[PDB]
Amino acid sequence: LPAPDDTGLQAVLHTALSQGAPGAMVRVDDNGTIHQLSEGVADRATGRAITTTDRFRVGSVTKSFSAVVLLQLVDEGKLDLDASVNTYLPGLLPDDRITVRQVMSHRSGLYDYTNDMFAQTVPGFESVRNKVFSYQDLITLSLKHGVTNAPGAAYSYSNTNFVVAGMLIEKLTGHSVATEYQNRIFTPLNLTDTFYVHPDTVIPGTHANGYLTPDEAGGALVDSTEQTVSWAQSAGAVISSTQDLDTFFSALMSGQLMSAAQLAQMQQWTTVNSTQGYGLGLRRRDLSCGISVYGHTGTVQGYYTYAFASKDGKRSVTALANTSNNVNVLNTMARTLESAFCGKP
Template identity: 40%
Template sequence: MRTQSPPAITQTKVLRRVTVTALAAALLAGTAVTAPGMAAADSSAATPKAATGQQDRPELQKATQAFVDAGFAGVQVRVHDKQGEWAGSAGVRKLGQSAKPPTNGSFWAGSIIKPVTATVVLQLVAEGKIRLDAPVAGYLPKLGLDRRITVRMLLQHTSGLFNYTGDFDPDGTYVPGISAAGKAWLDNRFRSYRPEELVRLALSKPARFEPGTDQKYTNTNYTLTLLLIEKATGRSYAEEVQRRILRPLKMRGTMVAGNRTQLPGPHAHGYYRYEEDGQEKVVDISRQNLSLLAGAGDLISTTQDLTTFISALNGGKLLPAKLLAEMRKPHPKMGYGLGLFVQDLGPDCGTVYQHNGSPPHGYGAFMHSSPDGSKTLTVSVTWVDEATRGPAKNYQKLVDRLVKEVFCGRQTAD
């Protein structure tokens, strides 16, 4: 079947009404910009470049460029397969400037920290310090948890706990939590939160369902898992991640963000656009505090480090085979195992193990791996977010196209 590229929505159309000079100057000053739109990207900056010493991969360049054509600000892509390693970027690092995103720049990786958290727990299971099917209340008695909730249920999102960033009742009524969206989040994006504070807020709300009877993706599960790791080891969560994963794998560009608000080294910028007093404003949100998502979304990383992690995990270097198999056993509702999504791409492509991530606004990331870790795809995307999600509404379609290109050798039809 003949395939087509997504309709090109050029940066000039999406970011159409502000002069480059005024916007760039305001963003460099770190201020909100009163603007009806944003500056167009330099078209010469939108062509990906293969990693040094690697052959040109036009099919990967095209799939990478598609993100920019659809209105995203910038994208970094890294592929490792039998042809070697390819890294490219497209779009712009910062609005109003022509420089492309670095091919291995740092970014807010969001929920990609969940498989990291799950891996640490399963290592503790292997060491006999935690039992996978034991009640979490036995380890953390002061929280007053339902004793039916097990460690496995936290990792698999089957605990039924309320999501502290807001959740829905069975009848569809929205129950607010700590705001992680819109202007309310923007105004509080540098606030620090303690993990126990987040968990106690969640526990103050009624459960969404009986433990083990359903599956619902909930950040509370992984923030609670952070507290479990600290209780079982007597060390901080960040120390355990560093000691068990980052240092052994030499993932020097990765860290648990904690209360850190600044991305280290070269990085692309994400933005949020909103309307106030009849005027559009654009804010650079590359600085933010992700303690709001402790253990569940507060990761800083690079495409190279995510490649290293997902390859090592699926290559059997981090967990015993039996526990890796448990991790990759999907619940039928969401296809989610213990910190990993299991995705069947069809008979011609096989199965991939993956996780995506996005802090509240402006950044997105995803990593995919073949079962043996020999073929991987890691990506970071930046955009100008807004109440309607801006170009992010096309995100999954573009992800699917790139995943198919890497793991099937072909693009998906539009």
């Protein structure tokens, strides 16, 4: 790999601040040499500076944790990727043809209930932030809508799929998803900054605050730090750090978290767009210099995450901006992958 470009990383973070991120940061683990940069504030009202050790909400990166659990259940003989979801959760879905593999790759057609929840950004956040939902509640909200495509037929990202994932994990193990994450992932990798505390609203330890950008241009930011994330659960509620997400995706890609057979299943790519794929709870992004990287993005109110590693796990990068609903920031923060993996142009 090219050398990571810290001057380029510095410029990406500075640009994200200029576009409305209160703080932005990035950590690279380059085969045992660390790169770490941060600019701006964790708390914009107190002025406390952001740093790469601050914990944050990783949003949809949670799907990779859920997928790892499910693929270990496949290794143990408890789950068949090509069985019907309804085989394990009878009567859950209106169509028996929807399979576990299709849910985990966003090919199930299940409508994403969060499109109803966040049609207005700040009002929808205000509606859900202090609510507790069961898994079944969220499924029911999805099933108010028809499926969007035939089983397996189309890629369509949907949080509902990883609500199903959490339901499967709990049904087949008899344990909470928190227990399964802790025993199968957090403890074995010593992820000391990583938690699943749902429905608690507190972020344990020193953390970046999240700042939700309102839909109105120029509108005042909303502190969105403390929420249940019950609307997402196994689709979105993990808390972590840049070091821990680097450790997790390095371990995943280097073959430490499941059998070779199940990692290969996880990396069977469904096309997302001309430079991206989706596996089983896993994203592929193709970079300008001809390198692909593997991991996941997250968007939860007030937090944008990128967490990706090289194919062999030897270089991993996690970047965080503590805003959301700001597409300029989102697009800028993607450039951290270019500077970290492709290096100086």
